[PDB]
Amino acid sequence: PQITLWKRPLVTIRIGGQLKEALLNTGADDTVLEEMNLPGKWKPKMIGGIGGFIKVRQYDQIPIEICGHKAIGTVLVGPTPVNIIGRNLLTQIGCTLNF
Amino acid sequence: PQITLWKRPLVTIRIGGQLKEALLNTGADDTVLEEMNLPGKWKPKMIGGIGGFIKVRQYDQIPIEICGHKAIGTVLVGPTPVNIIGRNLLTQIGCTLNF
């Protein structure tokens, strides 16, 4: 689809069998979800945002369906204010900016 | 133009006739620039995201050009780690997400 930006670009994702709402975020290197359980091994990581740094859990090679498009990649879990699909997975689903 | 998301979508902007690089950020409601001593009246504001909040100065009806496309609106200034173009200006230049 083509998504304009008068509102937040929120879409439905499916991850670990569950549905969530997430923001398509070209300002994020990485994908970061609010605290949730995911299967498999994880590693502690830190990431930075507008307000400073936070601790997250890094899960590799996690399948996620984003607005109907399949991706499999790294998902960070932690105290983000909103679920965030970042560039790592935006590229997988063929997303570009256009003006 | 079309901007792919393999790398941070950093583009050239012009503010006060002077050039800066800035991040096209569909995950930002508002536009925030790295500390610079811009003239004019401003109001204090707090903006937040990952990591918490930072204090910024809110300037109104500031002309900005983004990759050659003219815009005018509210520009925030403060200790962001990178210049950020948010949706308030991305909508003015007709920027869309496409996949």
Binding site: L23, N25, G27, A28, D29, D30, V32, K45, M46, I47, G48, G49, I50, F53, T80, P81, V82, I84, G86 | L23, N25, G27, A28, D29, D30, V32, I47, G48, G49, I50, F53, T80, P81, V82, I84, G86
Partner: peptide, 10 residues
């Protein structure tokens, strides 16, 4: 409300 979701790897 929090509205700027910049995110950077460390």
């Amino acid at each position: 409300r929090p509205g700027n979701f910049l995110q950077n790897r460390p």
